[PDB]
């Protein structure tokens, strides 16, 4: 997967998905896909890691 | 144990508010006291037109 | 990333779950046990409550 050359080194030092964002959906409440896209793809709101 | 950064930009959500800038409540809490500092200060304070 | 004129101190609060240990001495407290009482509160078309 191609990646910016100024991606942070410490991001790879810990357990993280290669997407650049966390992908946990069990954090959000059950049975709502809109909140799930808000966790996954929405860049209005920050990710659940940093 | 995820490293995080505290920065000026994240710190601006309090730094960009009117309660910093306006002096009226500071002035009110300062002059509503019985005795202020000895009032002797007189120099430039207002310009005097010739 | 230019330093502003003023530094800042940041204050936060944290919660911690603690399992405690409680010690108590003998004859610390006297307890007086009464007699329980019965009352009827809601009579409904389905079921009645006491």
């Amino acid at each position: 997967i191609v990646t910016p050359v100024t991606a942070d080194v410490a991001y790879f030092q810990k357990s993280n998905s290669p997407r650049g964002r966390a992908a946990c959906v069990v954090s959000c409440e059950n049975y709502n896909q809109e909140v799930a896209e808000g966790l996954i793809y929405d860049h209005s709101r920050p990710d659940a890691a940093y | 144990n995820l490293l995080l950064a505290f920065n000026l930009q994240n710190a601006l959500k309090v730094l960009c508010h009117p309660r910093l800038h306006t002096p009226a409540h500071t002035l009110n809490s300062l002059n509503a006291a019985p005795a202020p500092r000895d009032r002797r200060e007189t120099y430039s304070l207002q310009h005097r037109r010739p | 990333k230019i330093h502003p004129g003023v530094a800042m101190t940041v204050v936060r609060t944290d919660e911690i779950l603690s399992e405690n240990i409680l010690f108590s001495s003998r004859a610390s407290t006297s307890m007086f046990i009464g007699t329980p009482n019965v009352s009827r509160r809601e009579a409904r078309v389905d079921a009645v409550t006491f």
């Binding site: 954090s27 909140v35 659940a48 | 960009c16 | 204050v11 936060r12 919660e15």
Partner: peptide, 28 residues
Amino acid sequence: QQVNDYIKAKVGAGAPGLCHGQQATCEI
């Protein structure tokens, strides 16, 4: 109104999910 709208939009701008836990309010 324009300047206040700009300052509100640039910096000031529920959460969908969180991984770490209950967030802590930071005061400066």
